[PDB]
Design a protein around this ligand. Structure first.
Ligand SMILES: O=C(O)[C@H](Nc1ccc2oc(=O)[nH]c2c1)c1ccccc1OCc1cc(-c2ccccc2)ccc1Cl
Ligand SMILES: [K+]
Length: 497
């Protein structure tokens, strides 16, 4: 879009006395200084261009309330922007700012400042000039520190400093008591100030990927917390009762820390959680009763801990929907697994299991069952009742066949049986109305597919690589699933259908 098109547009604007001018998405290199005429502008959009500088004449637009500048190549702003004494909203994200332009520290009208994705290293003390700020975003820059004068921003509601190099917060941040979203993910925080309990309106606190080894006891005063994410730190305990005081917590991530037990406290801690993620710790026990009150707990992740067993009451988790216990040392699943009537996903991959409880058959809503990497020598006959099951992964167990009841799994689409000890499959494989994918690779002893495999008319993926299949003619099985399945339709007794 050419210099003369830009000037045509500015004349249309100044003539219609329009109060908004959108010059965005036009690969402009230089904004003409004729824009000084358009003093009746209250919004000017320049985002997504090739600007490497803002003309000074933009400072004449003394009624601007929005200056949208993202996705350009600005490395500074001109000092004349001082005249924008009503500018409430300034967007500079995705530029090449080596710092915040000093003029910006003088726009004390601003209530919204976006600086995501730049190369800023310092936030100057002058930041206290912008006390009307209610939203401040500097995520994806290179800020090593925040000044104490940030406690002067007594109207922040959203403070986003994710993906920087902060190692501390200044205790004065606790003067910002209107804050409700604080994102500190991907920094190098070693600790949090104790003033943090001042933030009694804080509802989303993101500390994932930091160097924290303790949570301040005062965080139990952030009674409005709804989501707390501490994923990947060096935390090994929390101050007692902490979770009990967070009377609205919906989701909690403690994953990838140093915990060996659950946080201490009663069911009061999880009375209100809906999602609880603790993968990648060393927790050796789910305490009896911690979920006795979690009436809306529906996603629990305990993957890769030190579980050797499940609690007596674990079938009381009647509203749970996703349960991941992969990569523990479980040697059996209790029979009260039948109480989990809401379960739709069960991940037990890479434990120590040889058989499954009879009670597994009662999860009438289970859609995905992951059992890879176990020691399974057979499946129970009661899986015939997993009426909703659609994905069943059994790779690298030691099954020799499958229950005849397998054929009742109407809804089953993915049947992963690779790396087993299968000798044959039951004829009732044929009533698998919806089987699309059937993995059978690496079964050194599978010597025949049944002819009723041809009645799976949605079957479009079958791997049999490295299976003798010596009961079928060698040259058929030499031509792969193409020819094996053809052979099973036409030379079996269903070629009529
Ligand atoms: O995906 C992201 O990096 C972020 N969404 C998020 C998801 C999980 C996180 O655990 C962390 O430790 N930080 C996280 C960020 C995103 C995505 C799209 C648009 C804005 C985003 O971020 C804004 C934001 C989020 C929070 C927050 C804090 C705790 C839990 C959930 C959200 C607070 C302030 C702001 Cl401004
Ligand atoms: K860690």
């Amino acid at each position: 879009s050419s210099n003369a098109e830009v000037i045509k547009e500015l004349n249309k604007c100044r003539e219609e006395n329009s109060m908004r001018l959108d010059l965005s998405k036009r690969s402009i290199h230089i904004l003409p200084s004729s824009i000084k005429e358009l003093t009746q502008l209250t919004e000017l959009y320049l985002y997504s261009n090739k600007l490497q500088s803002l003309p000074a004449e933009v400072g004449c637009l003394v009624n601007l309330m929005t200056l949208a500048l993202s996705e350009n190549s600005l490395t500074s702003l001109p000092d004349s922007l001082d005249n924008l004494k009503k500018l409430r909203m300034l967007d500079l994200r995705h530029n090449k700012l080596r710092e915040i332009p000093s003029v910006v520290y003088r726009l004390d009208s601003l209530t919204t400042l976006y600086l995501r994705f730049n190369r800023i290293t310092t936030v100057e003390k002058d930041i206290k000039n912008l006390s009307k700020l209610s939203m401040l975003s500097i995520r994806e820059n290179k800020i090593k520190q925040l000044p104490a004068e940030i406690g002067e921003l007594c109207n922040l509601i959203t403070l986003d400093v994710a993906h920087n190099q902060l190692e501390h917060l200044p205790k004065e941040i606790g003067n910002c008591t209107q804050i409700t979203n604080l994102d500190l993910q991907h920094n190098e925080l070693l600790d949090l100030p104790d003033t943090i309990g001042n933030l009694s309106s804080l509802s989303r606190l993101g500390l994932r990927y930091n160097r924290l080894s303790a949570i301040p006891r005062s965080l139990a005063k952030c009674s409005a917390l709804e989501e707390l994410n501490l994923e990947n730190n060096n935390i090994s305990t929390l101050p007692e009762s902490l979770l009990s005081s967070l009377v609205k917590l919906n989701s909690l991530t403690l994953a990838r820390n140093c915990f060996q037990l659950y946080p201490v406290g009663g069911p009061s801690q999880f009375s209100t959680i809906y999602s609880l993620n603790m993968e990648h710790n060393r927790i050796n026990k789910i305490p009896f009763g911690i979920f006795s009150r979690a009436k809306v707990l529906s996603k629990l992740n305990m993957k890769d801990n030190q579980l050797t067993s499940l609690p007596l009451d674990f079938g009381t988790w009647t509203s749970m929907v996703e349960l991941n216990l992969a990569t523990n040392q479980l040697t059996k699943i209790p029979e009260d697994v039948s109480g989990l009537v809401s379960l739709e996903v069960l991940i037990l991959s890479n434990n120590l299991l040889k058989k499954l409880p009879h009670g597994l058959g009662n999860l009438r809503k289970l859609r995905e069952l992951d059992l890879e990497e176990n020691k399974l020598e057979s499946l129970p006959n009661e899986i015939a009742y997993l009426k909703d099951l659609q994905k069943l992964v059994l790779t690298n167990n030691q099954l020799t066949t499958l229950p005849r009841g397998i054929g009742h799994l109407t809804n089953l689409t993915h049947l992963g049986l690779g790396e087993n000890l299968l000798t044959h499959l039951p004829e009732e494989i044929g009533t698998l109305e919806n089987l699309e994918e059937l993995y059978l690779n690496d079964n050194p002893n599978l010597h025949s597919l049944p002819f009723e495999l041809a009645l799976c008319s949605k079957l479009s993926i079958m791997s049999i690589e490295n299976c003798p299949l010596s009961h079928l003619p060698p040259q058929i099985v030499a031509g792969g699933p193409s020819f094996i399945i053809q052979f099973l339709k036409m030379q079996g007794p269903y070629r009529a259908m």
